Design an enzyme around this catalytic site. Structure first.
Site, PDB file in Angstrom:
ATOM      1  N   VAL A 172       0.842  -1.201   0.000  1.00  0.00           N
ATOM      2  CA  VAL A 172       0.000   0.000   0.000  1.00  0.00           C
ATOM      3  C   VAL A 172       0.878   1.251   0.000  1.00  0.00           C
ATOM      4  O   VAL A 172       1.619   1.495   0.959  1.00  0.00           O
ATOM      5  CB  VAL A 172      -1.100   0.023   1.080  1.00  0.00           C
ATOM      6  CG1 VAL A 172      -2.333  -0.708   0.593  1.00  0.00           C
ATOM      7  CG2 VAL A 172      -0.608  -0.563   2.401  1.00  0.00           C
ATOM      8  N   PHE A 174      -1.159   6.947  -2.166  1.00  0.00           N
ATOM      9  CA  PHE A 174      -2.616   7.031  -2.304  1.00  0.00           C
ATOM     10  C   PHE A 174      -3.179   5.830  -3.075  1.00  0.00           C
ATOM     11  O   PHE A 174      -3.677   6.005  -4.189  1.00  0.00           O
ATOM     12  CB  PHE A 174      -3.088   8.359  -2.956  1.00  0.00           C
ATOM     13  CG  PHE A 174      -2.312   9.625  -2.677  1.00  0.00           C
ATOM     14  CD1 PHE A 174      -1.429  10.141  -3.621  1.00  0.00           C
ATOM     15  CD2 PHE A 174      -2.508  10.335  -1.498  1.00  0.00           C
ATOM     16  CE1 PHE A 174      -0.737  11.330  -3.380  1.00  0.00           C
ATOM     17  CE2 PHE A 174      -1.797  11.514  -1.247  1.00  0.00           C
ATOM     18  CZ  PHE A 174      -0.926  12.009  -2.194  1.00  0.00           C
ATOM     19  N   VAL A 189      -1.519  -1.631  -4.178  1.00  0.00           N
ATOM     20  CA  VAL A 189      -0.802  -2.157  -5.349  1.00  0.00           C
ATOM     21  C   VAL A 189      -0.940  -3.681  -5.419  1.00  0.00           C
ATOM     22  O   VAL A 189      -0.636  -4.357  -4.443  1.00  0.00           O
ATOM     23  CB  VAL A 189       0.671  -1.684  -5.409  1.00  0.00           C
ATOM     24  CG1 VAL A 189       1.336  -2.116  -6.711  1.00  0.00           C
ATOM     25  CG2 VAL A 189       0.761  -0.175  -5.244  1.00  0.00           C
ATOM     26  N   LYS A 244      -1.886  -0.105  -9.435  1.00  0.00           N
ATOM     27  CA  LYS A 244      -2.185   0.814  -8.340  1.00  0.00           C
ATOM     28  C   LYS A 244      -3.679   1.156  -8.460  1.00  0.00           C
ATOM     29  O   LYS A 244      -4.110   1.659  -9.505  1.00  0.00           O
ATOM     30  CB  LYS A 244      -1.308   2.068  -8.446  1.00  0.00           C
ATOM     31  CG  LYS A 244      -1.155   2.850  -7.154  1.00  0.00           C
ATOM     32  CD  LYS A 244      -0.218   4.031  -7.378  1.00  0.00           C
ATOM     33  CE  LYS A 244      -0.071   4.930  -6.176  1.00  0.00           C
ATOM     34  NZ  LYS A 244       0.831   6.080  -6.464  1.00  0.00           N
ATOM     35  N   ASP A 277      10.511  11.679  -0.939  1.00  0.00           N
ATOM     36  CA  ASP A 277      10.274  10.326  -0.369  1.00  0.00           C
ATOM     37  C   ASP A 277      11.042   9.229  -1.160  1.00  0.00           C
ATOM     38  O   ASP A 277      10.476   8.258  -1.663  1.00  0.00           O
ATOM     39  CB  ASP A 277       8.750  10.034  -0.225  1.00  0.00           C
ATOM     40  CG  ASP A 277       8.340   8.696   0.361  1.00  0.00           C
ATOM     41  OD1 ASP A 277       8.797   8.372   1.486  1.00  0.00           O
ATOM     42  OD2 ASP A 277       7.497   8.008  -0.267  1.00  0.00           O
TER      43      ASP A 277
HETATM   44 CL   LIG Z   1       3.847  -1.491   1.615  1.00  0.00          CL
END
Ligand SMILES: [Cl-]
Ligand SMILES: Nc1ncnc2c1ncn2[C@@H]1O[C@H](COP(=O)(O)OP(=O)(O)O)[C@@H](O)[C@H]1O
Ligand SMILES: COc1nc(N(C)C)ccc1-c1cc2c(C(=O)O)c[nH]c2cc1Cl
Ligand SMILES: Nc1ncnc2c1ncn2[C@@H]1O[C@H](COP(=O)(O)O)[C@@H](O)[C@H]1O
Ligand SMILES: Nc1ncnc2c1ncn2[C@@H]1O[C@H](COP(=O)(O)O)[C@@H](O)[C@H]1O
Ligand SMILES: [Cl-]
Ligand SMILES: [Cl-]
Lengths: 293, 163, 369
Positions: free
Chosen positions: C16, C19, C22, C37, C131
């Site tokens: 996950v 947003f 997966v 996704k 990120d």
């Molecule tokens: Cl994850």
């Protein structure tokens, strides 16, 4: 013609450097401060912004300084009040009073052939590149920049029939009634020749017909730089003391070599000199571009 | 036809989907972790559905309903043309959705004018573009500067304006 | 009883992301695997991330780099949005560094080069992937690094900065954890620096159970260099993990570094005082009070966005063209504050650039410093 088709293909944008400077003067700006700004920033020409008209009306070059200097110099004993206290718009309305010439400009999308033609068509050296969408001036295009670009293609692509041909056999440039000065010649007189003859440089000659130096419109900028403009009575040779050996070409030399000699030394014109080191003619950057377009 | 997702949020052992689209025949939903699904395609228009959750006929109350003349509470789905194209669906979703001073970044303090050809300047950081820089007013005349990018080339314009 | 989207059968959940969920997708006929996704339209509108997804899709579609997960197709349904992307068997790079030990100098370099190559491709496309951690770096069957999860990534606009303090605290730059305004790439360099350390050491350079001391450690830029570490890579890590973003390495500075250049494959990379605005030393609210009394005095329409950010417009007396410019009050020091003037690009006329200077000159003539 092969070079003419090359110029019609490449756009003005391709000649604009990756990142450049552009000085723009307001027409309300004091003309003396305007020339001092050309020196300090190190630019030979600047577009003129009319705040009331909200458009680029013209260009301020060294020719303006040459014109103000000659039109208003009285003596070294009395200051050029007219140069000291005058706006750009005030003098532009005096200079272009009878003959009113508008702004000559090119688009970055327009071909180099059109740009080369526009320079000769209006008999100018500085052509500003203006984007139609934004209206902003991007780069001031010159003969030297086009010649530097063209010489890069001439050396890679095969040389034509006139490249191996002599300068005399092709007949390129002005050879009759060459505007010259002497060693003893004052700056004011030299400035006067620049006004009436409308030429970029004057070859300085000795007591004999042989050419010793060359006094260009660029060497006039030094008077503004050194703050020495108030004394125009001084000799041409005395003025050139601030700074090289003089570059010359012969009538029997090849056009390809002449083109290479100019761009390698980075000069606007070469002197057509005879066996006895005397002036016989002249060949400007504007002349080479004329035959090639 | 465009694919449509039928997800059952709620418990159960056996879950089936019955709809106008499949002549109300029970269609078994697959369960992953705890939730039950079925991705089947529907023609753009009006469709009525219901669920059979562990021997009980129910409608998802979170989803829109329609009560019949005969008193039949069924779930309704209006499969729109916009629901099939990604940027059309994201456009309609955007439309459906209806202190101390910041510390000066050091990037703006970096200039290309202070730090060879005088006309030639270094490539500037994307962040300092369109920003106005000025010079201390000397001789009663203001000097302004800013770097703007035209296509893939940069132009730093200097304006000499009297004040 | 097969859940199918496009022509792939949806399978198990890979994880996950930012947003969405997966899942694996094996083709009905060929058996080709993809990563899907699944973004619920109603959920992605509950958070005002609708624009964020529009941009993310736009970017990932145009991209095509060997170390960035390829977005194959986007399938839209009335309920959800399905993002079909390339699948990589090797899983997380973080997990590789966990199950196996730290990577050797040779393998560490190999993978660092591949990551930085992708990080460069992003920046060259005005996309800054915030990120950036080994949890977001995936591996294929042949040990090749692959950048994934562009959920927190943002665009790099000309003249504009970024504010969002997004990503893991361990990988976040001092300016990110301090919540200060950043340009963009410099924060990815810091993240790439911590990824490099993670590869060579198997551990994090900045880590503590106590969050306040962790943040101090990051802003102090101090980390342990084990004896087995090559001093050349230590110099790279020192340059990459600089607290000062102006003293921090650029992808160009890294490309030039001796340790990076070693065995670097060809396919990976191509190839008189000025002041910003005015400095009024008054109270932050008192400066904003002076500019609004000056904007209206010059007859100009404006819209207040933040108590320090303003957007102003003025109609030309000749061409009648409306030109726009933004004002922003920054804090230089505890004693001095500065006002910033930024041009706004519109959509024959006069000249956009000169017209912008005219605006600023008016407001400067009636302002402090
Ligand atoms: Cl994850
Ligand atoms: N684009 C232009 N628009 C209006 N006037 C111009 C333009 N370019 C040049 N001029 C004018 O032409 C005259 C001669 O200029 P020029 O030959 O270009 O001199 P220089 O060789 O010093 O650059 C000057 O009075 C100058 O103001
Ligand atoms: C139970 O749900 C699913 N099961 C699948 N199987 C292979 C059994 C595949 C996909 C989903 C799915 C999940 C979600 C979701 C979520 O899990 O939050 C949101 N919207 C979705 C839409 C679908 Cl089609
Ligand atoms: N000293 C000079 N005497 C006469 N004509 C000249 C002289 N210098 C340049 N020219 C000519 O002036 C024209 C424009 O050249 P230029 O202004 O020098 O770039 C060309 O036709 C040149 O041949
Ligand atoms: N034929 C020439 N030989 C040597 N120097 C020259 C020649 N023509 C011009 N110059 C010099 O070039 C400078 C002016 O440059 P420009 O007019 O821009 O080409 C001055 O220093 C002149 O003395
Ligand atoms: Cl694989
Ligand atoms: Cl780890």
């Amino acid at each position: 013609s092969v070079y003419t088709t090359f110029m019609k293909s490449h756009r003005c944008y391709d000649l604009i450097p990756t990142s450049s400077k552009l000085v723009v003067f307001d027409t309300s700006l004091q003309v003396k401060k305007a020339f001092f700004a050309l020196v300090t920033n190190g630019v030979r020409a600047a577009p003129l912004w009319d705040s009331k008209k909200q458009s680029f009306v013209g260009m301020l070059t060294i020719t303006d300084f040459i014109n103000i200097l000659h039109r208003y110099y009285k003596s070294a004993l009395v200051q050029i009040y007219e140069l000291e206290e005058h706006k750009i718009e005030t003098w532009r309305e005096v200079y272009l009073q009878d003959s009113f010439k508008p702004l000559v400009c090119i688009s970055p999308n327009a071909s180099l052939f059109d740009a080369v033609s526009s320079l000769i068509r209006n008999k100018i050296h500085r052509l500003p590149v203006i984007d139609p969408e934004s209206g902003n001036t991007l780069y001031i295009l010159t003969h030297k920049r086009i010649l530097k670009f063209l010489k890069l293609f001439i050396t890679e692509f095969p040389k034509p029939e006139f490249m191996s041909k002599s300068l005399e056999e092709l007949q390129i440039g002005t050879y009759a009634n060459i505007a010259m000065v002497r060693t003893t010649t004052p700056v004011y007189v030299a400035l006067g020749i620049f006004v009436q003859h409308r030429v970029s440089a004057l070859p300085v000659v000795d007591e004999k017909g042989r050419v010793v130096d060359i006094y260009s419109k660029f060497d006039v900028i030094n008077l503004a730089a050194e703050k020495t403009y108030n004394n125009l009575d001084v000799s041409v040779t005395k003025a050139l003391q601030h700074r090289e050996g003089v570059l010359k070409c012969y009538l029997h030399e090849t056009l390809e070599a002449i083109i290479n000699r100019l761009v390698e030394a980075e000069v606007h014109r070469l002197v057509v000199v005879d066996e006895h080191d005397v002036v016989k003619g002249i060949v400007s950057l504007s002349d080479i571009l004329q035959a090639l377009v | 036809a465009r694919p449509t997702v039928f997800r059952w949020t709620g418990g159960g052992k056996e879950v089936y989907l019955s709809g106008s689209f499949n002549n109300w025949s029970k269609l078994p939903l697959t369960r992953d972790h705890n939730n039950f699904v079925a991705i089947l395609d529907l023609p753009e228009g009006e469709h009525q559905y219901k669920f059979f959750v562990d021997g009980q006929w129910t409608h998802d109350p979170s989803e829109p309903i329609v009560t019949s003349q005969l008193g039949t509470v069924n779930n309704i789905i209006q499969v729109k043309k916009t629901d099939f194209e990604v940027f059309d669906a994201l456009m309609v979703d955007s439309q459906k959705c209806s202190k101390a001073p910041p510390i000066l970044p050091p990037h703006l303090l970096q200039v290309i004018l202070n730090k060879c050809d005088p006309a030639l300047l270094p490539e500037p950081n994307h962040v300092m573009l369109n920003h106005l820089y000025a010079l201390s007013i000397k001789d009663g005349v203001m000097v302004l500067s800013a770097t703007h990018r035209y296509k893939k080339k940069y132009v730093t314009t200097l304006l000499y304006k009297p004040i | 009883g097969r859940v199918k989207i496009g022509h792939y059968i949806l399978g198990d959940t890979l994880g996950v992301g930012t947003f969405g969920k997966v899942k694996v997708g094996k083709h009905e006929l060929t058996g080709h695997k993809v990563a899907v996704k699944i973004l619920n339209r109603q959920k992605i509108r509950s958070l005002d991330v609708v624009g964020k997804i529009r941009r993310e899709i736009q970017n990932l579609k145009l991209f095509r780099h060997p170390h960035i997960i390829k977005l194959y197709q986007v399938i839209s349904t009335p309920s959800d949005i399905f993002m079909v992307m390339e699948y990589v068997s090797g899983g997380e790079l973080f997990d590789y560094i966990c199950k196996n030990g730290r990577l050797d100098e040779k393998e560490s370099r190999r993978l660092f080069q591949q990551i930085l190559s992708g990080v460069d491709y992003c920046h060259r496309h005005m996309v800054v992937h915030r990120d950036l951690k080994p949890e977001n770096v995936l591996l294929d069957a042949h040990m090749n690094a692959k950048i994934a999860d562009f959920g927190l990534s943002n665009m790099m606009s000309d003249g504009e900065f970024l504010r969002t303090s997004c990503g893991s605290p361990n990988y976040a730059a001092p300016e990110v954890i301090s919540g200060r305004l950043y340009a963009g790439p410099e924060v990815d360099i810091w993240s790439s620096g911590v990824i490099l350390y993670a590869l060579l050491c198997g551990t994090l350079p900045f880590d503590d159970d106590h969050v306040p001391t962790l943040f101090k450690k990051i802003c102090d830029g101090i980390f342990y260099t084990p004896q087995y570490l090559n001093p050349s890579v230590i110099s790279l890590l020192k340059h990459m993990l600089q607290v000062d973003p102006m003293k921090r390495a650029t992808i160009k500075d890294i490309r030039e570094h001796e340790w990076f250049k070693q065995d670097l494959p060809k396919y990976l990379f191509p190839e008189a005082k000025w002041h910003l605005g005015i400095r009024s030393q008054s109270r932050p609210n008192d400066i904003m009070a002076e500019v609004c009394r000056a904007i209206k005095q010059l007859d100009y329409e404006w819209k207040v966005v933040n108590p320090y950010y303003l957007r102003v417009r003025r109609k030309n007396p000749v061409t009648s063209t409306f030109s726009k410019m933004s004002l922003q009050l920054y804090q230089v020091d505890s004693r001095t504050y500065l006002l910033d003037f930024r041009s706004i690009d519109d959509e024959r006329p006069g000249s956009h650039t000169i017209e912008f200077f005219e605006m600023c000159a008016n407001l400067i003539k009636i302002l402090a410093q």
